[PDB]
Amino acid sequence: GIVLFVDFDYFYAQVEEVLNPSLKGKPVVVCVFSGRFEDSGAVATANYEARKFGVKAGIPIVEAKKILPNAVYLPMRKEVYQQVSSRIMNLLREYSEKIEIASIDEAYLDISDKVRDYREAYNLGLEIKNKILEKEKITVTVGISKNKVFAKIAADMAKPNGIKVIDDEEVKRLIRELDIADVPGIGNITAEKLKKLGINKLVDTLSIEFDKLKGMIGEAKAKYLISLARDEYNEPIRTRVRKSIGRIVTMKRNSRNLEEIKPYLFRAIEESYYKLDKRIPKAIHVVAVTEDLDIVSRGRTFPHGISKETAYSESVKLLQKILEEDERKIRRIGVRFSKFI
DNA sequence: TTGGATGGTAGCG
DNA sequence: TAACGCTACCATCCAAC
Numbered sequence: 268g269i270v271l272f273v274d275f276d277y278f279y280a281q282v283e284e285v286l287n288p289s290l291k292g293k294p295v296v297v298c299v300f301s302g303r304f305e306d307s308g309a310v311a312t313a314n315y316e317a318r319k320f321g322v323k324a325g326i327p328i329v330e331a332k333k334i335l336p337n338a339v340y341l342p343m344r345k346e347v348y349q350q351v352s353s354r355i356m357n358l359l360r361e362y363s364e365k366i367e368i369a370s371i372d373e374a375y376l377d378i379s380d381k382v383r384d385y386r387e388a389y390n391l392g393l394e395i396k397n398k399i400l401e402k403e404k405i406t407v408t409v410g411i412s413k414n415k416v417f418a419k420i421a422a423d424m425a426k427p428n429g430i431k432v433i434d435d436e437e438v439k440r441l442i443r444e445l446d447i448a449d450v451p452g453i454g455n456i457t458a459e460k461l462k463k464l465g466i467n468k469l470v471d472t473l474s475i476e477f478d479k480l481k482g483m484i485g486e487a488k489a490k491y492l493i494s495l496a497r498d499e500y501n502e503p504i505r506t507r508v509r510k511s512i513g514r515i516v517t518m519k520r521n522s523r524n525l526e527e528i529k530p531y532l533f534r535a536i537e538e539s540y541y542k543l544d545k546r547i548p549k550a551i552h553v554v555a556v557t558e559d560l561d562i563v564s565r566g567r568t569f570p571h572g573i574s575k576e577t578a579y580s581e582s583v584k585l586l587q588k589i590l591e592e593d594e595r596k597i598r599r600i601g602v603r604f605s606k607f608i
Numbered sequence: 609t610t611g612g613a614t615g616g617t618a619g620c621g
Numbered sequence: 622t623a624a625c626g627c628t629a630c631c632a633t634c635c636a637a638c
């Protein structure tokens with residue numbers, strides 16, 4: 268098994284640098300402005316120059332400006348980045364039929380049948396890198412290993428503009444030495460739970476009672492980690508199929524007034540159905556985020572597809588359920604469609 | 609006894 | 622002050638039997 272993973276470098280900010288080369292080598296921050304007030308919202312990403320000052324994905328814009336006033340702050344232009352991504356993903360298709368688009372800027376290629384060994388794999392990764400740079404002026408990082416997880420870890424190690432093979436011997440080192448927090452799928456919550464069991468490395472999972480690990484992190488995560496630690500993870504590269512399409516918005520003022528919330532809702536519905544394009548959903552979920560940032564959702568599943576017109580009145584009822592079942596005011600309202608025909 | 613629907617949690621792009 | 626889009630999983634719980 269040989270897996271090649273491509274991960275585009277500081278993607279949104281890098282596109283902005285291609286579009287405006289005067290930006291290169293200076294801090295750039297790409298921002299999701301929420302509408303509420305001036306500079307309200309969060310950072311989507313930033314180039315490496317900006318990151319040296321602590322500006323990264325997810326922090327409040329106002330906060331980024333306290334540590335880095337000097338940078339270029341740009342609004343996130345999602346459609347534009349998606350156009351570049353779509354073009355890159357079509358280039359990568361030329362290297363293997365077995366490809367899994369993981370996100371806007373990640374793809375896994377199964378090249379087990381295209382190359383004989385890691386040496387040939389490395390050469391392919393360089394060809395891929397060079398072709399993307401020539402055709403799109405975009406640098407990417409390539410990770411190569413025996414399965415998807417270690418391929419992704421290899422890319423993390425070589426970021427930005429890198430290429431790294433993690434061979435059989437280094438897989439063994441990583442099982443022994445990689446902080447378990449650095450394994451894909453392990454965030455703060457799981458990592459903290461792991462520390463309480465004395466688990467700091469993948470290898471620590473081998474010598475714990477399976478039922479004890481399961482009771483702390485659940486069956487799926489327990490099985491995942493043990494499989495990796497046993498050097499047995501071998502999940503196939505497969506075509507991802509979109510399962511849900513949804514849209515969420517921050518309202519100008521927090522509200523409990525149905526007639527005030529409704530236009531925001533209807534807007535999210537129109538935006539979702541537009542993206543759905545020929546796909547027909549059998550389920551609808553409305554989500555509200557209250558003043559104190561709690562999340563509430565109400566949904567309904569039908570035995571048949573939901574027309575755009577039906578989605579309107581169905582979403583209203585779901586919002587009314589939330590408003591009857593939660594007395595707090597609402598700050599954000601969203602809708603999502605799923606269970607496609 | 610069991611299995612889709614339900615709403616929530618965790619991770620992450 | 623704290624975006625927003627998506628997958629996977631988890632507990633729980635009610636109607637089929």
Ligand SMILES: Cc1cn([C@H]2C[C@H](O)[C@@H](COP(=O)(O)OP(=O)(O)OP(=O)(O)O)O2)c(=O)[nH]c1=O
Nearest residue numbers: 275276277278279311312324325372426427621
């Ligand atoms: C992590 C993250 C990414 N994104 C978007 C912007 C990123 O450019 C894009 C890809 O995410 P990443 O691959 O996580 O980040 P990146 O490409 O900007 O930086 P890196 O060099 O470290 O790989 O997804 C968000 O909108 N919100 C987020 O919280």
Ligand SMILES: *Nc1ccc2c(c1)Cc1ccccc1-2
Nearest residue numbers: 513514515554601602603626
């Ligand atoms: N980004 C994003 C957009 C819409 C929705 C979420 C995330 C979660 C959720 C839950 C229910 C309805 C809509 C959404």
Ligand SMILES: [Ca+2]
Nearest residue numbers: 274275276277
């Ligand atoms: Ca990236």
Ligand SMILES: [Ca+2]
Nearest residue numbers: 274275372373
């Ligand atoms: Ca990525």
Ligand SMILES: [Ca+2]
Nearest residue numbers: 448449453454
């Ligand atoms: Ca982590």
